[PDB]
RNA sequence: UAAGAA
RNA sequence: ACUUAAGCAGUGGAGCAUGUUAUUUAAUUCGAUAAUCCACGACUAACCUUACCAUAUUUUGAAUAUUAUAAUAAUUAUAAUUAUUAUAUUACAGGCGUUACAUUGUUGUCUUUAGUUCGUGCUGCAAAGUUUUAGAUUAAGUUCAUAAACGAACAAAACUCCAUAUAUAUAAUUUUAAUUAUAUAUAAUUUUAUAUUAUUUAUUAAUAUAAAGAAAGGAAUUAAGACAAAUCAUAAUGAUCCUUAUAAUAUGGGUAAUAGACGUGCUAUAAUAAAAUGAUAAUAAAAUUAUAUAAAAUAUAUUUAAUUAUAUUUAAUUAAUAA
């Protein structure tokens, strides 16, 4: 009856991933949150954005959760840092900058992000500037 | 309390008043302290008066500070209390929150935070829809569950029937319009929503189910 | 767009539009707001839209809420509003729907900006630079740049390659053949990257200058790498080849139905 | 499935055709979709996300975390109302619940519990409280006071009933329970000529000695006040009588009803039991 | 809070804590329990 | 032609 | 039935460390005191911390508000208003002052939490009672059964959450720990079969023997009374007291003094136990690193080297990567 085109159908299914053709890692995106829900939702959204931008993205690799603990004297409190890793392959710098800009614009509450960019390339002092000033002062210049 | 559904469970992120993650921990501590100070300021800002004998005390909940990568959103609930031709005091307050051109509060807060700030006030018409507001105001079950469970079973069985009918007539079953036949925004959302009804109270612990 | 700033042009229009323009004027101007006759006449025109007398609306326009004054709680619950706790779930669903609409209709538009991968040749571009960006944060480590290169991809003769490794010292890892150095001494990443490039140029120039000393008598010191390797567990063992029993592996058994279904 | 732009033009807005075209060009029509095991992105229903729902989507022009307007472009200036009222009917009334006198509730409850007629109870019974007391019980945590109500109900046509109710909270509740009990205890009272008692009654109820005497037409109710109220409810018009020994109001009230029901025999009962004809001389004197 | 009087002159905010402090100061000064006059040079 | 109340 | 008693395994007469107390002291900041006992907080006291002592020094002080002045920017039609900053003004601020300064609150400990109300129904004239029952069983409210009582709400339980076992997903298996990580889901509060004992006679329970199971632990979650607590540092309010000083700052000193007494800990008093040595490096987990972390190397103690401790120099890593 009602046509539901492929873009809408894709929302109801796991995000598509483009195949990795050469295996040139061009960036890794680490997402961190003190909860896992927003983190994983945002990771799925990043995968969708990357697919449509033409970027091969492997997936939100689970990284070890960091636990912080505090004892109140015997009440125990703890904080969990959940971490996901999304790696990008075989992509130009400009498309990848577009990815980062778009996912920054539409980020979720409570999720931080670190981005490492790997750029293959062809082969081809405050104290010091004050120590000189002190040594060229009359108080120190008089002993020398 | 289905965790896989955003209408059937409270996101664990929402049980913190400051919702943030910074790789730079110094900045995260600073932002937490900023949120507490701004909450105290906003509490101070909720009392107004139209000359003596005209005191108006808006009651706001705790602020919810949603820190994203490029923006902070300070959301709070509030309770207040021919009108088309003037602005009462509460309207003026909210309009300085966002809408004034020159010295609106969110621009000043943006300087304080060094990131974009928006403010989201949400009016609550009753005082017993929010335990914090109810407390700040008084300063100055089986049958419903059974109906909810019946609705959940009905929805699940509806989707199951749809899918088996497709299989009768890989893992990719078929078109989305037939897998979700009688599953519409006009029947599913409000029936699966949780915490619609206040089923218990002890004056301030309000139990919503 | 700025029609709310020009009350002269409110003449006409729907009365509800005039009300909205008046409210926008008040909201935007705040205390800078002041009476304007044209706006008052436009509101007189709306006097019929809302059941309010002309005199009353002029009175309210001039004296505001004071004019209104001059002219509950614990109410019964009508089941017409949600608890704030349920409104949090409604907001979670609003967020979900917003992202779903983005994925449905704005993400496909990003397909216009697809580019073909201009793979830099590994031989031509063997040096990799790693930059760090903490999105939405002022992090001191965002200035760090790391330069890595496999030394055998530097185009050095054997004597010069040896001299390079000797001079690299702990930055060179003989097990992986990776020369790596990092810089975060300058406030900006571009400065640190240029600094690392310049260091590499000096190292290559000295390694190729064999007119004075080639350091052929100095063996390659691997002590830093030994110390590094002792800190990581080494699972360097594999199942004995002669223990394997392929004779014992399960053998696929013929099944007629599957073959007659592949027809 | 992939569709002709011709067909889509009829079902989707003009501004959305571009994204659908680009999607169909970027997603091969052989694509095999998998469901996500652990992260649910789409809602639990079907939606093409072409329409902004007034309640389930963020209100346009409202500030929030994902507001796409600029700070100087929000279009909400009136804060006196909830910005997003509920969808559908505009309420969340549970099935079996109603939106937000005593005789009506007694009648409804007793019709549900015993199958008696509510209309009769509401439009033909009159209640009269007889005694209203505060009793008390000594318990380890102090004195617990209860309100006690004895009431009488009747239709002035030979039906009368006494009821007792007791409530630790309010006298309204004790009287409500007494009214309930009285309706449940409705009896039929023999009456001679629908105005008096058949003969005389000398009835003992615990410590109360009742002496009731039938009276002539026009003679009033010359009796104890409790008995007067009971007679008013029962349809007794003419009566003389005296109470001896105990004059406790509750015991008088209760014992007068056993006196009316147990210590009376109608003329028909006597005539049939004895096989004799009992003639009322005054009834026959006037034809 | 004190800046609010200058940013938004058409809104007159009330600091409950400050008003309570002033009311207590005046109540003490009515009982003769108020602070003495600070000595001055 | 027999009324009770505190 | 907390407790005792028994059994097992220890520790326990000294030195030191750390507390408390006593005495001393300018100060050794503060903490108990109704007759068994018991003043006893330290996630770091050189300065800071700090509350204490000595000596100097400050006087509207850290706040808010009023009223003036002196500038500085904006606006009127040149003076003026509007604000911002300083100076003064006095209401005051300030108080590790007071619990022999009282209230709530909160916190701790302890007792009770298969029980408390409500609704109907039933019994007694009624106040009241709600009846078997002083039930069975378990280590236990544990698990059951029963009655003129039956429900509901809470409470308890179930549930939930950890962990454990398994499935799916994810990781281009060089951030490698795939023997991993962390999301989702499943599982058990285990079940079946005989035999012997008892039984309220089995469709019960225990023991034993078989059978299937990876299956064997833990945490949280409610109220009501009683008493204690002012380092209540679990607050708020009030009262009361000081206001050139009971507030505030600097320099130094003390909290580290030593006759005693006691608590706790560490190191010992030797052979079922101490020492040294053990480089293709026996075998971990959990944490930490932008207010860092410190590799390898070199030098000295130092003696071929190693070990150990510093210095020189800072490689890598702001981290499933390096330390
Ligand atoms: Mg000191
Ligand atoms: Mg000092
Ligand atoms: Mg004071
Ligand atoms: Mg002091």
Swiss-Prot record, chain A:
It is found in: Mitochondrion. Its main location: mitochondrion. Keywords: Mitochondrion, Phosphoprotein, Ribonucleoprotein, Ribosomal protein, Transit peptide. GO terms for biological process: mitochondrial translation. Disulfide bonds: none annotated. Transmembrane segments: none annotated. This is Small ribosomal subunit protein uS10m. The gene is RSM10.
Swiss-Prot record, chain B:
Component of the mitochondrial small ribosomal subunit (mt-SSU). Mature yeast 74S mitochondrial ribosomes consist of a small (37S) and a large (54S) subunit. The 37S small subunit contains a 15S ribosomal RNA (15S mt-rRNA) and 34 different proteins. The 54S large subunit contains a 21S rRNA (21S mt-rRNA) and 46 different proteins. uS3m, uS4m and uS5m form the narrow entry site of the mRNA channel. Belongs to the universal ribosomal protein uS3 family. The gene is VAR1. It comes from Saccharomyces cerevisiae (strain ATCC 204508 / S288c). It comes from the Eukaryota. The chain holds residues 78 to 398 of 398 of the full protein. Transmembrane segments: none annotated. Keywords: Mitochondrion, Ribonucleoprotein, Ribosomal protein. GO terms for cellular component: mitochondrial inner membrane; mitochondrial ribosome; mitochondrial small ribosomal subunit; mitochondrion. GO terms for biological process: mitochondrial translation. Component of the mitochondrial ribosome (mitoribosome), a dedicated translation machinery responsible for the synthesis of mitochondrial genome-encoded proteins, including at least some of the essential transmembrane subunits of the mitochondrial respiratory chain. The mitoribosomes are attached to the mitochondrial inner membrane and translation products are cotranslationally integrated into the membrane. uS3m is essential for mitochondrial protein synthesis and required for the maturation of small ribosomal subunits. Signal peptide: none annotated.
From Swiss-Prot, chain C:
Signal peptide: none annotated. GO terms for molecular function: structural constituent of ribosome. GO terms for cellular component: mitochondrial inner membrane; mitochondrial small ribosomal subunit; mitochondrion. Transmembrane segments: none annotated. The keyword rRNA-binding does not apply. It is found in: Mitochondrion. Belongs to the mitochondrion-specific ribosomal protein mS35 family. Present with 3150 molecules/cell in log phase SD medium. This is Small ribosomal subunit protein mS35. It comes from Saccharomyces cerevisiae (strain ATCC 204508 / S288c). The lineage of its organism: Eukaryota, Fungi, Dikarya, Ascomycota, Saccharomycotina. The chain holds residues 48 to 318 of 319 of the full protein.
Curated annotation (Swiss-Prot), chain D:
Pfam families: Ribosomal_S5, Ribosomal_S5_C. It comes from the Eukaryota. Residues 125-189 form the S5 DRBM domain. One of its GO terms (cellular component) is mitochondrial small ribosomal subunit. The keyword Ribonucleoprotein applies. InterPro entries: Ribosomal_Su5_D2-typ_SF (IPR020568), Ribosomal_uS5 (IPR000851), Ribosomal_uS5_C (IPR005324), Ribosomal_uS5_N (IPR013810), Ribosomal_uS5_N_CS (IPR018192), Ribsml_uS5_D2-typ_fold_subgr (IPR014721). Keywords: Mitochondrion, Ribonucleoprotein, Ribosomal protein, Transit peptide. One of its GO terms (molecular function) is structural constituent of ribosome. Belongs to the universal ribosomal protein uS5 family. Component of the mitochondrial ribosome (mitoribosome), a dedicated translation machinery responsible for the synthesis of mitochondrial genome-encoded proteins, including at least some of the essential transmembrane subunits of the mitochondrial respiratory chain. The mitoribosomes are attached to the mitochondrial inner membrane and translation products are cotranslationally integrated into the membrane. This is Small ribosomal subunit protein uS5m. It comes from Saccharomyces cerevisiae (strain ATCC 204508 / S288c). The gene is MRPS5.
């Amino acid at each position: 009856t009602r046509p539901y085109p492929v873009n809408v159908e894709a929302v109801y299914y796991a995000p598509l991933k483009l195949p990795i053709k050469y295996g040139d890692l061009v960036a890794d995106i680490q997402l961190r949150s003190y909860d896992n829900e927003n983190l994983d939702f945002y990771s799925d959204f990043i995968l969708r954005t990357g697919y449509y931008l033409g970027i091969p993205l492997t997936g939100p690799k689970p990284l070890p959760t960091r636990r912080e603990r505090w004892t109140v004297i015997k009440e125990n409190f703890e904080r969990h840092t959940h971490k996901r890793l999304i790696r990008a392959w075989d992509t130009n710098p400009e498309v990848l900058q577009m990815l980062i800009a778009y996912i920054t614009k539409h980020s979720m509450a409570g999720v931080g992000m670190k981005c490492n960019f790997f750029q293959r390339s062809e082969i081809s002092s405050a104290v010091g500037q004050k120590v000189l000033e002190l040594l060229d002062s009359p108080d120190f210049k008089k002993h020398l | 309390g289905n965790i896989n559904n955003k209408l059937q469970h409270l996101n664990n992120m929402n049980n913190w008043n400051t919702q943030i993650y910074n790789y730079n921990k110094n900045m995260e501590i600073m932002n937490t302290m900023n949120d507490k100070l701004i909450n105290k300021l906003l509490y101070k800002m909720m009392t107004l008066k139209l000359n003596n004998m005209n005191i108006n005390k808006i009651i706001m909940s705790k602020t919810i500070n949603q820190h994203s990568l490029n923006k902070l959103n300070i959301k709070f609930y509030y309770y207040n209390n021919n009108n088309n031709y003037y602005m009462n005091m509460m309207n003026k307050l909210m309009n300085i929150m966002n809408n004034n051109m020159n010295n609106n509060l969110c621009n000043i807060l943006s300087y304080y935070y060094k990131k974009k700030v928006t403010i989201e006030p949400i009016k609550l018409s009753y005082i017993y829809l929010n335990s914090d507001i109810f407390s700040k105001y008084i300063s100055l079950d089986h049958n419903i569950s059974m109906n909810y469970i019946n609705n959940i079973n009905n929805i699940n069985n509806n989707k199951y029937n749809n899918m088996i009918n497709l299989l009768n007539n890989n893992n990719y079953i078929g078109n989305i319009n037939n897998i979700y036949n009688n599953m519409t925004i006009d029947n599913i959302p409000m029936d699966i929503l949780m915490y619609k009804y206040l089923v218990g109270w002890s004056i301030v612990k309000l139990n919503f189910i | 767009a700025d029609l709310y700033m020009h009350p002269e042009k409110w003449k006409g229009l729907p009365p509800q539009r005039i009300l909205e323009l008046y409210w926008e004027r008040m909201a935007r101007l705040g205390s800078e707001y002041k009476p304007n006759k044209d706006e008052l006449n436009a509101l007189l025109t709306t006097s019929e839209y809302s059941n309010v007398p002309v005199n009353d609306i002029k009175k309210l326009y001039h004296r505001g809420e004071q004019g209104a004054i001059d002219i509950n709680s614990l109410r019964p619950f009508m089941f017409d509003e949600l608890p704030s706790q349920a409104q949090e779930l409604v907001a979670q669903h609003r967020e979900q729907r917003f992202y779903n609409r983005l994925a449905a209709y704005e993400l496909p538009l990003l397909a216009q900006y697809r580019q073909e991968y201009k793979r830099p040749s590994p031989e031509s571009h063997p040096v990799t630079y790693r930059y760090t960006s903490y999105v939405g944060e002022e992090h001191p480590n965002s200035r760090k740049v790391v330069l890595s290169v496999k030394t055998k991809e530097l185009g050095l003769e054997e004597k010069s390659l040896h001299k390079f490794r000797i001079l690299a010292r702990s930055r060179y890892d003989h097990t992986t053949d990776i020369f790596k150095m990092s810089s975060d001494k300058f406030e900006h990443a571009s400065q640190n990257a240029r600094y690392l490039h310049d260091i590499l140029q000096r190292l290559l120039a000295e390694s190729k200058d064999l007119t004075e000393d080639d350091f052929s008598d100095v063996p390659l010191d691997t002590r830093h790498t030994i110390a590094k390797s002792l800190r990581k567990k080494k699972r360097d063992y594999e199942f004995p080849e002669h223990w394997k029993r392929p004779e014992d592996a399960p053998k696929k058994k013929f099944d007629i139905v599957d073959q007659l279904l592949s027809t | 499935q992939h569709y002709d732009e011709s067909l889509l033009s009829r079902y989707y807005p003009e501004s959305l055709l571009k994204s659908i075209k680009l999607a169909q060009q970027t997603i091969p029509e052989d694509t095999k979709f998998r469901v996500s095991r652990n992260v649910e992105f789409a809602p639990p229903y079907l939606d093409d996300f072409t329409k902004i729902h007034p309640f389930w989507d963020y209100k346009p022009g409202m500030p929030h975390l994902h507001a796409q307007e600029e700070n100087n472009n929000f279009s909400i200036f009136r804060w006196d109302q909830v910005q997003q009222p509920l969808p559908g009917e505009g309420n969340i009334l549970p099935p079996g619940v109603s939106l937000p006198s005593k005789s009506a509730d007694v009648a409804a409850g007793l019709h549900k519990q015993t199958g008696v007629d509510p209309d009769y109870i509401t439009r033909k019974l009159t209640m009269k409280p007889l005694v209203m007391k505060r009793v008390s019980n000594q318990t380890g945590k102090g004195k617990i006071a209860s309100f006690y109500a004895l009431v009488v109900v009747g239709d002035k046509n030979g039906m009368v009933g006494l009821g007792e109710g007791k409530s630790r909270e309010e006298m309204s509740k004790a009287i409500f329970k007494a009214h309930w009990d009285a309706v449940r205890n409705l009896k039929e009272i023999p009456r001679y000529e629908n105005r008096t008692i058949y003969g005389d009654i000398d009835f003992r109820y615990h410590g109360v000695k009742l002496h009731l005497r039938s009276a002539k037409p026009g003679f009033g109710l010359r009796v104890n006040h409790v008995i007067f109220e009971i007679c008013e409810c029962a349809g007794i018009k003419d009566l003389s009588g005296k109470v001896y020994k105990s004059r406790n109001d509750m015991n008088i009230a209760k014992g007068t009803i056993e006196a009316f029901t147990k210590a009376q025999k109608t003329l028909d009962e006597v005539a049939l039991g004895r096989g004799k004809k009992l003639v009322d001389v005054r009834k026959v004197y006037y034809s | 809070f004190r800046h609010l009087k200058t940013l938004y002159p058409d809104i007159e905010f009330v600091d409950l804590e400050e008003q309570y402090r002033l009311s207590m100061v005046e109540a003490k000064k009515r009982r003769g329990k108020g602070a003495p006059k600070k000595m001055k040079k």
